[PDB]
């Protein structure tokens, strides 16, 4: 989506695996604030939205 | 109130020490209160912050 009108998707009732974006070479950005990048796998949350 | 010298007492006891155990909760500017969800979300150059 345009960034006026970006996409707001609900990820929910799921397994998060984030090591297959952490470690992939696809990424410039990738940058976490409130959390580092290689703890998400040991986290739960009620509500992941991209 | 006959006795309030020595109720006086347990309170203020019970009072400063129920004050250091909330005052536990307290963030100081810290993300969290808790070392727990400090050490489970930070690694440690920016959790020892």
Known sequence: ?50 | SALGKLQDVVNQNAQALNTLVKQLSSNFGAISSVLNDILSRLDPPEAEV
């Open chain 1, 1 to 50: 989506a345009s960034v006026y009108a970006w996409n707001r998707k609900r990820i929910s009732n799921c397994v998060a695996d984030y090591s297959v974006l952490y470690n992939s070479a696809s990424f410039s950005t990738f940058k976490c604030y409130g959390v580092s990048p290689t703890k998400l796998n040991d986290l739960c949350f009620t509500n992941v939205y991209a």
